[PDB]
Amino acid sequence: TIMLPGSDYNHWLIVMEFPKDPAPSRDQMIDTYLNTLATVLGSMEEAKKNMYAFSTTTYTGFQCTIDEETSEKFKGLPGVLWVLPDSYIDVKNKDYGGDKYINGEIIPS
């Protein structure tokens, strides 16, 4: 009955863990988010359309519009640490936070 604002189980936070020998660049992390999402959805086009936010600093993960059954497919994939229902960080603005991704366009938070 109780759920965080914005948590509708159609928005998902996928937190990844990256190597340290070497640590990947920011761009490599973003490419990894999209490649992982594309593996699950079936195309890079669909991955770019459904990744709406990400971070490479505060956290190293991405946020995407997928259903709950599709979110389960990320568990066990290389580098996937957490698969968690997303929630607003700014409730008034219905903002899920992170750097924004608009079908290929990166807008820093």
Next chain:
Amino acid sequence: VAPTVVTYNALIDGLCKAGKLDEALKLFEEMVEKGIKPDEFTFSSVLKACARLGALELGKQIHGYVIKSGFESNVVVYNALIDMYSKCGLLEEARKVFDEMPELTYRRVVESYCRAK
């Protein structure tokens, strides 16, 4: 600490102590809905309420919220996350939080899991 956060934390804690766990979670939901910023004591109390209710879904939502809010490194919050996962029957998830932290023994994590099963 902000007086309204003090107030919500104390009410949430009081409801938890009274065994009124659903009411504590309702207050926490309102806190977030109204834009009042939870702190590590808020998260600790509400994750304990989730652990005692078996409210794993809200616990996972809070986990995502904590990750994004920079509480990734907080000992009070990660202890509460471990307790929530272990009492909700997910030892492997509790282990992953445990391994993220820089005391708490894994023996205590396993004991909490086993005693809740």
